[PDB]
Write a protein that holds these residues in place. Structure first.
Motif, PDB file in Angstrom:
ATOM      1  N   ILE A  14       0.919  -0.972   0.077  1.00 46.99           N
ATOM      2  CA  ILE A  14       0.012  -0.122   0.009  1.00 46.99           C
ATOM      3  C   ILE A  14       0.804   1.256  -0.027  1.00 46.99           C
ATOM      4  O   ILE A  14       0.541   2.163  -0.473  1.00 46.99           O
ATOM      5  CB  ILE A  14      -0.951   0.118   1.170  1.00 46.99           C
ATOM      6  CG1 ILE A  14      -1.919  -1.270   1.237  1.00 46.99           C
ATOM      7  CG2 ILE A  14      -1.897   1.315   1.230  1.00 46.99           C
ATOM      8  CD1 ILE A  14      -2.880  -1.137   2.265  1.00 46.99           C
ATOM      9  N   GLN A  15       1.848   1.324   0.832  1.00 48.74           N
ATOM     10  CA  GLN A  15       3.040   2.401   0.770  1.00 48.74           C
ATOM     11  C   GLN A  15       3.320   2.892  -0.652  1.00 48.74           C
ATOM     12  O   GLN A  15       3.236   3.882  -1.055  1.00 48.74           O
ATOM     13  CB  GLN A  15       4.116   2.249   1.493  1.00 48.74           C
ATOM     14  CG  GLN A  15       4.896   3.453   1.841  1.00 48.74           C
ATOM     15  CD  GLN A  15       5.902   3.568   0.449  1.00 48.74           C
ATOM     16  OE1 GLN A  15       6.168   2.622  -0.144  1.00 48.74           O
ATOM     17  NE2 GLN A  15       6.427   4.794   0.352  1.00 48.74           N
ATOM     18  N   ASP A  16       3.528   1.726  -1.509  1.00 50.78           N
ATOM     19  CA  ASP A  16       4.241   1.909  -2.867  1.00 50.78           C
ATOM     20  C   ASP A  16       3.515   2.469  -3.808  1.00 50.78           C
ATOM     21  O   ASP A  16       3.308   3.312  -4.561  1.00 50.78           O
ATOM     22  CB  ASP A  16       4.886   0.840  -3.640  1.00 50.78           C
ATOM     23  CG  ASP A  16       5.651   1.048  -4.824  1.00 50.78           C
ATOM     24  OD1 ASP A  16       6.644   1.801  -4.870  1.00 50.78           O
ATOM     25  OD2 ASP A  16       5.192   0.505  -5.934  1.00 50.78           O
ATOM     26  N   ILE A  17       1.954   1.797  -3.688  1.00 49.24           N
ATOM     27  CA  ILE A  17       0.817   2.216  -4.628  1.00 49.24           C
ATOM     28  C   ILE A  17       0.476   3.607  -4.064  1.00 49.24           C
ATOM     29  O   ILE A  17       0.399   4.449  -4.976  1.00 49.24           O
ATOM     30  CB  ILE A  17      -0.315   1.275  -4.487  1.00 49.24           C
ATOM     31  CG1 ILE A  17      -0.031   0.078  -5.141  1.00 49.24           C
ATOM     32  CG2 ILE A  17      -1.521   1.741  -5.147  1.00 49.24           C
ATOM     33  CD1 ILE A  17      -0.941  -1.376  -4.689  1.00 49.24           C
ATOM     34  N   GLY A 249      13.552  -3.937   0.311  1.00 53.24           N
ATOM     35  CA  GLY A 249      14.078  -2.581   0.515  1.00 53.24           C
ATOM     36  C   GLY A 249      14.395  -2.116  -0.860  1.00 53.24           C
ATOM     37  O   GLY A 249      14.269  -2.566  -1.726  1.00 53.24           O
ATOM     38  N   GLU A 250      14.672  -0.464  -0.872  1.00 54.77           N
ATOM     39  CA  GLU A 250      14.506   0.041  -2.119  1.00 54.77           C
ATOM     40  C   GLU A 250      15.758  -0.335  -2.983  1.00 54.77           C
ATOM     41  O   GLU A 250      15.747  -0.012  -4.205  1.00 54.77           O
ATOM     42  CB  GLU A 250      14.454   1.584  -1.763  1.00 54.77           C
ATOM     43  CG  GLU A 250      13.098   2.165  -1.973  1.00 54.77           C
ATOM     44  CD  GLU A 250      13.178   3.774  -1.693  1.00 54.77           C
ATOM     45  OE1 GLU A 250      14.133   4.256  -1.222  1.00 54.77           O
ATOM     46  OE2 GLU A 250      12.418   4.504  -2.289  1.00 54.77           O
ATOM     47  N   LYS A 251      16.921  -1.001  -2.461  1.00 52.80           N
ATOM     48  CA  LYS A 251      17.833  -1.289  -2.889  1.00 52.80           C
ATOM     49  C   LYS A 251      18.127  -2.816  -3.237  1.00 52.80           C
ATOM     50  O   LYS A 251      19.037  -3.486  -3.462  1.00 52.80           O
ATOM     51  CB  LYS A 251      19.460  -0.943  -2.367  1.00 52.80           C
ATOM     52  CG  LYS A 251      19.217   0.584  -1.866  1.00 52.80           C
ATOM     53  CD  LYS A 251      20.420   0.971  -0.794  1.00 52.80           C
ATOM     54  CE  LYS A 251      19.827   1.236   0.471  1.00 52.80           C
ATOM     55  NZ  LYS A 251      20.607   0.937   1.537  1.00 52.80           N
TER      56      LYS A 251
HETATM   57 MN   LIG Z   1      10.104   3.472  -2.509  1.00 49.26          MN
END
Ligand SMILES: [Mn+2]
Ligand SMILES: [Fe+3]
Length: 281
Positions: A14-17, A249-251
């Motif tokens: 949900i955070q990314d959407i 995670g983002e990486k």
């Molecule tokens: Mn992100």
């Protein structure tokens, strides 16, 4: 430009959407961190401060976050919105949560369109100053999501109907399986402390043997040992880790919702392909 609108979500999908809809006019943060088990998560003092500082809290509903109701009592004067209005639920059919909805509705890209609409609606109501930006970003992101359907069907297109068996650890893939014509087999219906898993492992071993299913999978927030035990006893390949309950995670390998759908489907398809170690027969 003062401090932006602050949105807090329960978990990372949900955070990314939401962050794609928000673009640069709002900051969206997740309570659970990448890799953390989300169904029975135990919130911390950090989590309360984060939610209490938000202007809007988004959550899945569908009984996903078993912790949210108690958590949300400790939050004063922050509005919440469920992001699954208009989703058609599939039931959990076995075990101690029989009859409760399967909450993993986001695994269908067509359901992500509904998540997007609900999140867009809530942002527009609670931050009307940026309504134009949320609407434009929601439309552009929905376009990207719609564009996934044909290539996802192409990736899976070489598995004939009777061989489309998706065997995973949590039964978290029901919405994806229905959209792409797969039959599902799981080691437990939904994450929980529960009885019956050793007997279900024996049951699944039998199904795989009967149907010559070539691959079984685990997921990124739970243990791979039961799936590996099935692989050992059946001779099916262990197909690796699928992502459903958390981004990386983002990486890492699955930084976004779109990367989660693509990688999960690609890993499934690779499990059925014959491109391993070849001899000249
Ligand atoms: Mn992100
Ligand atoms: Fe799950």
């Amino acid at each position: 430009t003062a401090k932006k609108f602050k949105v807090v979500t329960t978990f990372t999908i949900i955070q990314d959407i939401a962050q794609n809809i928000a673009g640069d006019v709002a900051v969206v943060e997740s309570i659970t961190k990448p890799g953390a088990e989300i169904h029975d998560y135990q919130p911390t003092p950090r989590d309360i401060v984060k939610a209490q500082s938000a202007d809007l809290i988004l959550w899945n509903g569908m009984n996903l976050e078993r912790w949210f109701e108690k958590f949300f009592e400790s939050i004063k004067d922050v509005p919440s919105a469920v992001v699954t209005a208009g989703i058609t639920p599939l039931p959990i059919r076995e075990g101690p949560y029989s009859g409760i909805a399967n909450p993993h509705a986001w695994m269908s890209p067509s359901n992500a369109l509904i998540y997007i609409e609900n999140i867009r609606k809530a942002l527009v109501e609670h931050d009307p100053a940026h309504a134009e930006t949320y609407n434009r970003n929601a439309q552009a992101y929905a376009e990207k999501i719609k564009a996934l359907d044909a290539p996802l069907r192409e990736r899976l297109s070489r598995i004939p109907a009777e061989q489309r068996w998706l065997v995973t650890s949590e039964g978290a893939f029901s919405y994806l399986a229905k959209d792409y014509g797969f039959k599902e087999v799981y080691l437990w219906p939904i994450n929980a402390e529960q009885q019956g898993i050793p007997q279900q492992v024996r049951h699944v071993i039998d199904i795989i043997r009967e149907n010559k299913i070539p691959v079984v999978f685990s997921e990124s927030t739970i243990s791979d040992k039961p799936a590996k035990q099935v692989s050992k006893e059946t001779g099916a390949q262990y197909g690796g880790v699928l992502y459903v309950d958390s981004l990386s995670g983002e990486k890492g390998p699955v930084p976004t919702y779109i990367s989660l759908i693509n990688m999960t489907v690609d890993t499934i398809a690779k499990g059925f392909g014959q491109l391993e170690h070849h001899h000249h027969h």
